[PDB]
Amino acid sequence: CDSGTGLTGNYSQDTLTVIATLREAIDLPQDAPNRQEVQDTARGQINDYISRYRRKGDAGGLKSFTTMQTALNSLAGYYTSYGARPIPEKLKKRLQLEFTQAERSIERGV
Template identity: 55%
Template sequence: MTDVWRSFSRSAGAALSTALEALGSGLFSRTWWSRTLTPVLAIVLGLSLTLSSCGSVGNSLSGSYVEDTMTVAESLLGTIALSQDDPARPDAENEARVLINDYMALYRPKGRVNGLPSFTTMQTALNSLAGHYTNYANRPIPDALKARLEKELKKAETSVVRGT
């Protein structure tokens, strides 16, 4: 990581000093730019990246695997039940994508959860739906996929309630 910052600071410092020399300004030397401005730019860039990740929309998941699985399954069942000409469908699909990403990002790395049959079933359903939204965004969900998703989401709901 430090090699990246070093190369960035060298190239940024060199570009800035070259630009100043091109303008004919002799007020600041090359060493001033490399010692002063480059670290300042690196700090500003780091802070902007850090703060922009803090400003994201709040997560709709509670952190309880059982509750979150039930919530996500019910929400997705409602989304896939919408008709193709429903005006709320695009918003519901966008919310479903966010929910799928949040759910998988939260529970896939957790070893005590990702080995459960309910998680495996849920993951299969979420991957299928996410794949459809990615590859066929403007097309309706095929009946066969819709039936399979309904079956898998209901199976995940029942198995998570049982504790598996």
């Protein structure tokens, strides 16, 4: 589609920045009755990070990075035929688990 970019995967800031678009998609303001469209913009980042800036700081235990791949598969699951139906378990669970694992964990609370 458009593999390649200039991403630099700075660090943590870049980690939340990417998921931030995802977490915003699952529950974007009422100014976007198309959680799927906004997700499209995120897809670009994926190709950029995964298809241009895959390198980073893989300490060999990153629980967040592993989720990015777990939720990624789930995300695209919702965009399927654009099913405007209740967020499936794997979607909500992965997005919730990812949103929480992303938002909750990165938030540094527990």
